[PDB]
Design a protein around this nucleic acid. Structure first.
Ligand SMILES: [Ca+2]
Ligand SMILES: [Ca+2]
Ligand SMILES: [Ca+2]
Ligand SMILES: [Ca+2]
Ligand SMILES: [Ca+2]
Ligand SMILES: [Ca+2]
Ligand SMILES: [Ca+2]
Ligand SMILES: [Ca+2]
Ligand SMILES: [Ca+2]
Ligand SMILES: [Ca+2]
Ligand SMILES: [K+]
Lengths: 61, 98, 86, 87, 99, 56
DNA sequence: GCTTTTTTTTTTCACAATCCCGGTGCCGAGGCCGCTCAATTGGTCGTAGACAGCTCTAGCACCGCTTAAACGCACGTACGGATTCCGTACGTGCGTTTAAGCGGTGCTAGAGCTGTCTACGACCAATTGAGCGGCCTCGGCACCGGGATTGTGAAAAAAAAAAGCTGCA
DNA sequence: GCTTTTTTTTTTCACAATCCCGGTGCCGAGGCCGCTCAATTGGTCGTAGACAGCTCTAGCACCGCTTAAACGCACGTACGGAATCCGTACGTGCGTTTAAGCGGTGCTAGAGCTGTCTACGACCAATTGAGCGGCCTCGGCACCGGGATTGTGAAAAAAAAAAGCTGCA
């Protein structure tokens, strides 16, 4: 269900490992059940610790 | 004339590689390493191609995760730069290291 | 071994340090310490002796402190214009 | 009669000097005052997870008493295998 | 004139005292109550074998002593001597106990 | 073998958990084998990080 | 104050890099097809375990006595962390070099399938000795007091590392 | 090259904690007994898996293009880390307060055993339909190019502070 939604947001008919990864890692509970498990070809969720960003805000159109 | 400040292209790459899922180590070198490490266990071994991919997938996942943990140790010491002690402390705390 | 340090007085040695760098921000405590070894004879208690006189020169009004607090900062002499050194 | 179990807030019975001793065994030399409460919460989470499983093992066996094996099997499941109480 | 040990010296002494020993360091009855408190939250009117309560205490103190070792490494990592809750939170995050 | 030697170093005729714990935690391999195992009544090996000692 | 000299802040600039949107290439998802196997049906047979009923462990309550530990506060030391400064380890960018990757071809090791045959392990029943609970004792060891040894810390005294000051190359 | 300070030792002395011995007394390791139930022995019976023989998948070795990515090098900015400095958090030690631990006694839930009896699950042989491998088609998605949005960094203006210095009350 979740990965299907992920593929739909991607404008994609087909579920791929990344759609399964995104589903699993943004679901607090599925993430715990599958937390010592590696999804081949899933990658990782976007995440950059705040102290590594620059701080200045001046924005987009 | 034009040049980006240190850290800017770094952030750009972080964004780039967290967005994607391709393997980041080059495949043939990786394969050569596997074969080489394997030789110290059994001579003249063959490898299903998927078994090498399966090991690369795993390695790369292992390391990407270790770097996440390494970054946190760097930041805990009020640093932005990862250093070997950050990798060592992570590995110590994970139970991998004595 | 160097047996003594045949030198001037420290109030003069720090005053001589600032005059040999015309910097508007002022000479720091590490920049003065880099001078006193490299261009004069000095002790091994020297760096602590540099820090102690700048507390006596701040408290007396001889040496003015630009940016910072205590002996961690950068200072300059009360009058920039002097007769012959700078 | 049947003597009700009064929830007294016993987490505070895990004293400051006790927490300090545990840290001495752990080789800790100096201790922020914020430690002693952080620990209690860390301890509580530990105890809940072990005791939930243990009590699950108790329930499945149709027993009213938590045994030392329930606790042992619980700690095994949580990856915190304990020697000296059976199994 | 009355004798006083510098700060650190009695702490270092305690470390040695407790690393040499194996006695449980949490007082038994307080512990035993806490367990029962917590146990209510999942099932009502439960009895315990005392070995079950000792097994839990052995297990807890072992885990906490263990966590303190990792907490002490995180504190030292950041050029300190004083464990603080972010040390504990880092240890547990790298341990994968916590999100 | 290793637990006994620790009982002897402790001037004790009988092996007790602490002797097993010293045996295991000072032997590189046994420690790995039992790296996720808690030995009740065993304590820990004496270890005090260098940084925490006096400068003298 | 005014002016000098920073410091900060927006503006404004130009401008790379990313994203987005429209057309082209080809491989693998998805379904159809024979067909073998593994799930189903309907039957028999044997014991696993639900249940009740009884034994008696051991978990729970309660007491009051001692004293060990927890608690709270006085006191100041040495720790944490902010600020500030310096030197170079790193990140960016460019041009040159390298070898990955791709697509194709050619060879065969060895994965894996099949059928055969028998050595081996399940099952049984009868036999009997290892290992069980129960029980008893006596030496190891936990706990004590006393004295010896060790390490810590404050203040004193001696040794050797520097201060400014003396005339002057 | 001279006092007169530091700072850097080494010393000496008091004090508290820890170590180590023998004395003492208690209780659990250790070993013996007597009986039981789980291992053993000797037997049959069926099939799991080693083994030989064959098929053909896919692992390997090679090759030569085309480039994307690795490399080496020039250059400087922003980081890591050393050092100061200041305020108080946290360690130490003391007097007072609290309740853990202890040893004991009394009561009873409920752990855990036994015996009975039957529902349910293994095991079977006959039945058949769901899911297997294999193979073909076409639609989704990956490329690609070339146009639009988005942030970044420099430079400038401005603002605004701050810095250095003074008049004048
Ligand atoms: Ca049936
Ligand atoms: Ca039965
Ligand atoms: Ca026995
Ligand atoms: Ca005793
Ligand atoms: Ca004996
Ligand atoms: Ca540096
Ligand atoms: Ca810094
Ligand atoms: Ca019952
Ligand atoms: Ca039944
Ligand atoms: Ca198919
Ligand atoms: K093959």
């Amino acid at each position: 269900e979740l990965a299907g939604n992920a593929a739909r947001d991607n404008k994609k008919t087909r579920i791929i490992p990344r759609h399964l990864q995104l589903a699993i890692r943004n679901d607090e509970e599925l993430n715990k059940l599958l937390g010592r498990v590696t999804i081949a070809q899933g990658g990782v969720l976007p995440n950059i610790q705040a102290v590594l960003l620059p701080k200045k805000t001046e924005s987009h159109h | 004339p034009h040049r980006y400040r240190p850290g800017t292209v770094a952030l750009r790459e972080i964004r780039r590689y967290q967005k994607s899922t391709e393997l980041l180590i080059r495949k043939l070198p990786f394969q050569r390493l596997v074969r080489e490490i394997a030789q110290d266990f059994k001579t003249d071994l063959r490898f299903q191609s998927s078994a090498v991919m399966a090991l690369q997938e795993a390695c790369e996942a292992y390391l990407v995760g270790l770097f996440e943990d390494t970054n946190l140790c760097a930041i805990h010491a009020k640093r932005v730069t990862i250093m070997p002690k950050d990798i060592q402390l992570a590995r110590r705390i994970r139970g991998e290291r004595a | 071994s160097r047996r003594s340090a045949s030198h001037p007085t420290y109030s003069e040695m720090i005053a001589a340090a600032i005059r040999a760098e015309k910097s508007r921000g002022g000479s720091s405590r590490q920049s003065i310490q880099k001078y006193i070894k490299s261009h004069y004879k000095v002790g091994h208690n020297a760096d602590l002796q540099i820090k102690l006189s700048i507390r006596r020169l701040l408290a007396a009004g001889v040496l003015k402190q630009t940016k910072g607090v205590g002996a961690s900062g950068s200072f300059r002499l009360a009058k920039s214009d002097k007769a012959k050194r700078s | 009669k049947r003597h009700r179990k009064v929830l007294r807030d016993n987490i505070q019975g895990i004293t400051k000097p006790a927490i300090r001793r545990l840290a001495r065994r752990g080789g800790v030399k100096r201790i922020s005052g914020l430690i002693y409460e952080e620990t209690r919460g860390v301890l509580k989470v530990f105890l809940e997870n072990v005791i939930r499983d243990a009590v699950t093992y108790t329930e499945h066996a149709k027993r009213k008493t938590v045994t030392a094996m329930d606790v042992v099997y619980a700690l095994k499941r949580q990856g915190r295998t304990l020697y000296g109480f059976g199994g």
